[PDB]
């Protein structure tokens, strides 16, 4: 995903990769040894020492976060629900549908739904509320299989119906298409878009800013239901957040130029 987690191939400098990184395997019997680095990796490494527990990290196979197709849950949520893992670190938004089955810790960063446009006055604006005027035909984001997709589909039928003709390849192709002009607006998570404008060719920006945040929530750590690990990790992470190093990690990994 976004710089919370980054996958890098080992370098021939040492027949591997240096410290400040942890080996990670791409599951699928044979495996190639990669090593993963990022924000969540750093927070996990910092957490491990205090509570003194062992860990092994492995990637997801099916991918695409989480979904519920007739109870067939894929992704990290699918992996943790069927008792195939103990925790699922990384990008994950706490909402009503997910929390029914799997327990969560406290949030550590702020996030939500934002809007990205090329260089509108909120969700309830008539442009997104009344798609019937043909002279300003706008465009949207809506990376499918997304957490926000469920919300926008559940809350506004007309927008979901009119969002069919939307660019959908990645958080990379949308930026290129917007820089081209093949679309008009983009909607996705907040903590990733506000960073994505941090270091970009020129200065592409968003609307008013953090004042325009919809369904404000945070990222969290999932865990199997009814385990002492849940309480232990939650209290430890609260103590760490109260310490204040989270700001240092943020300024190390979440700073931009524009």
């Amino acid at each position: 995903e976004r710089p919370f987690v980054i996958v890098e191939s080992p370098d021939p400098g040492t027949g591997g990769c240096v410290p400040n990184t942890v080996p990670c395997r791409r599951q699928s019997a044979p495996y190639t040894k990669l090593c993963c680095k990022g924000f969540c990796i750093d927070i996990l490494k910092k957490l491990a020492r205090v509570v003194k527990f062992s860990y092994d990290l492995y990637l997801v196979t099916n991918g695409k976060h989480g979904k519920r197709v007739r109870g067939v849950w894929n992704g990290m949520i699918g992996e943790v629900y069927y008792k195939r893992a103990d925790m699922a670190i990384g990008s994950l938004t706490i909402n009503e549908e997910r929390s029914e089955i799997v327990d969560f810790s406290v949030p550590f960063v702020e996030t939500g739904i934002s809007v990205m446009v090329a260089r509108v006055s909120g969700l309830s604006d008539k442009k997104f509320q009344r798609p019937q005027d043909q002279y300003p035909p706008f465009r949207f984001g809506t990376v499918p299989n997304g957490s926000t997709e469920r919300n926008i589909r559940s809350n506004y039928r007309d927008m979901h119906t009119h969002m069919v003709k939307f660019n959908q390849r990645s958080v990379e192709d949308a930026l290129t298409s917007l820089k081209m002009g093949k679309l008009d607006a983009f909607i996705y998570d907040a903590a990733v878009l506000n960073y994505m404008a941090g270091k970009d060719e020129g200065c592409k920006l968003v609307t008013i800013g953090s004042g325009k945040v919809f369904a404000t929530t945070g990222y969290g750590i999932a865990m199997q239901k009814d385990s002492h690990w849940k309480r232990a990790i939650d209290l430890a992470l609260l103590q760490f957040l109260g310490d204040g190093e989270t700001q240092k990690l943020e300024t190390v990994w979440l700073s931009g130029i524009c």
């Binding site: 706490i94 406290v106 949030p107 702020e110 209290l235 609260l238 103590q239 109260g242």
Partner: protein, 35 residues
């Protein structure tokens, strides 16, 4: 008492004893100055 509904922030010491629910409005600490 049995329940607290007030602007009560969360910290380690209080988290040691009582159990909290999910938060509903984020904030911080800021300085008040007179113009």
């Amino acid at each position: 008492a049995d329940m607290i509904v007030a602007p009560l922030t969360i910290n380690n010491e209080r988290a040691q004893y009582i159990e909290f629910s999910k938060p509903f409005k984020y904030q911080g600490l800021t300085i008040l100055v007179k113009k």
